[PDB]
Amino acid sequence: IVGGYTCGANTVPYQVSLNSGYHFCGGSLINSQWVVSAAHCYKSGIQVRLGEDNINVVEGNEQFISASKSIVHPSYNSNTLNNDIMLIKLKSAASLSRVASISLPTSCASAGTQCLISGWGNTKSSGTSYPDVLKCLKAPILSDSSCKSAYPGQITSNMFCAGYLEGGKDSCQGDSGGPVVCSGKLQGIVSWGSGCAQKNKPGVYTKVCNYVSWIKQTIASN
């Protein structure tokens, strides 16, 4: 997260870290045994870390649980990045104030809605600086038109832009799969962008409201 602020220990209870020997992506806890993240974060041997703040030191509120199943959306396209969504089943159920699930949206959010994006990704636009603690960023959802003018012929109906056209505030490498929560509902998944915090290049997110049925049914039949 570039241009954000320290969230504060366990203030984002649904935020998880996907670890494969080191933090490589974020994710959201939407059920005591399920996590939602990005399809491009698919990797074998994933260990999910919950109740994390400082990802580098064991503080005592953590729960490390390995994944038993990783289900990438059947229509995920690695070239176009369309349907960049994945579900991870925990090997055992998490014990749910510091660890809690986030609700799925009942409906899609509108342009202008303010959302909270969080993660342990790079905090520099020109450079590399990964934080110990979780960073937060409040960014508004942008209209489909400006998103499309920012990324010509790249935005699908399953993606939305959020951020600032002036730049300086954005998600970045290491934030993928993390939550974009608006009005207490999970509306997006950190997905892609062009650099980080660049002017006229807002971040692109997976539009979660479009997958709620697939999510609920997939969780129930696995």
Partner: protein, 56 residues
Amino acid sequence: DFCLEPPYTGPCQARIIRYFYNAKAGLCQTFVYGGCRAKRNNFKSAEDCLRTCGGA
């Protein structure tokens, strides 16, 4: 020769550590790959990297 190409992080935002052949140094080094749109000078281990590009 794709072995001479600079490492490509790509548009996605994961922080996945991969290897690329650094012809200037004559060795495989690590870099951060974003998770999508990988170019060919991007390997999962130093051994794969050396086997494909070693000596380029």
